[model samples]
Target: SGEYPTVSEIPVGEVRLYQIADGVWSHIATQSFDGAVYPSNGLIVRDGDELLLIDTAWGAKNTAALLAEIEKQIGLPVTRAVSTHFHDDRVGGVDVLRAAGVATYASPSTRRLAEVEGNEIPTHSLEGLSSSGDAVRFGPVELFYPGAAHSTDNLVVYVPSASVLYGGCAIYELSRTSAGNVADADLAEWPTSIERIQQHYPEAQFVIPGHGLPGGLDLLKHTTNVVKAHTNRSV
Candidate 1:
């Protein structure tokens, strides 16, 4: 009751931010994929002073709206950000963060692919992670690359103080029956990546995903199951 205060959804330019744990909030934004409105999410971690944004959602944005609203509501400025992967849902606000002079950190692979694929590129390479299980610390937030799942360079963002794991699209919400978008998904390594995260961040209290709602370790479990099921049937 006290740890996770039931907070209201604060909206900004079609995006909604929800407080999932103490000092951690997940922002959800929407876009239409093949004519159907789809949702994408990201996380904001407040480390007593400034904030760190994970992912950045999945659509065109109004640039300053998110950062402005975040500072307006949370009262702390977001000085840095980490976009989990190369997808728009993961890096949509790279420009937005840059507009506020925030460095957008990402894996080298993500930046390479973004450069080739024409997606918004991250400004800096994430330090302290060269292989699976290696983690980087930034203001109490742990950035770990668990092989590859949703994308070849997806990194799981975890907050030790808040007990929150922001897995982005790699860890799906329970309601996602199909592997949403496999364009950049590493099918062979998907389940393995999820297992690695499950093993590493066992103490995570809240698991915020790329879309839909958040859950506990069950999101990791369900994601492995869905990926395995999808992988098995592939010819």
Candidate 2:
């Protein structure tokens, strides 16, 4: 893996923002991992007084820069954060966010797996963990752990206001999404999960993947198409 940059070196402030919805935006972190295959990305949703971070980048070092960028733009505390998967790149930054007093949310599956599956959720004496699947409201932003795909505990965040879907690692760019990266993939259930997501926001314009540039309805369609093709012929 490539060495991570220092907090001061990360150009979080210069990072381009992709507008996924009216009040929702995304910041691309393509280099979280070394390979060009699985480029990691993150989400920022503006609810009201607080902002919701979708997934922590790769490490605490990267996450620290993300927070700094958020503070620069939103000027509000990160009241809530959601982890898409248990990968170190995704949740390894939990400590950084917890230190800031932000509440972190994850799918029940994620919580349970981390507790039982393997060395998933870090029990490192931090705070902001909810296993009850209760709704976490940060001002106008209400968040929850939708379900899984990338891992047993992958969490998908929904923004009802803008109908933007944060697919975390569960979702990937249509053109690049491959099955190999999915150490934990519910392929049989992936489609059903899509149905559940559509049920919540039938008109969702943006489907933000854990990695890759933010895309529109075409992206969602592309993802479905890829899934269908893969189902027919294994990739």
Best by TM-score: 1
Per-residue lDDT of candidate 2, residues 1-235 (tens digit): 0122222333532343455556677765534324332346778887667677777766676677778877776677788776666677577677788888878766555555655644236333212324323345544444544444456555666677876767776665765754536556666666655555556556766677766655655665556566666677865
Please, what are the lDDT tens digits per residue for candidate 1 over residues 177-203? 887889888999888888899889999
Off by over 4 Å in 2: 1-16, 19-22, 32-38, 115-148, 231-235
CA lDDT of 233 in candidate 2? Answer: 85
TM-score for candidate 1, residues paired by index: 0.90
**Alpha carbon lDDT at 69, candidate 2:** 72
**Number of clashes found in candidate 2:** 1
Question: For model 2, what is the alpha-carbon lDDT of residue 8?
Answer: 34
Q: TM-score each candidate.
A: 0.90, 0.73
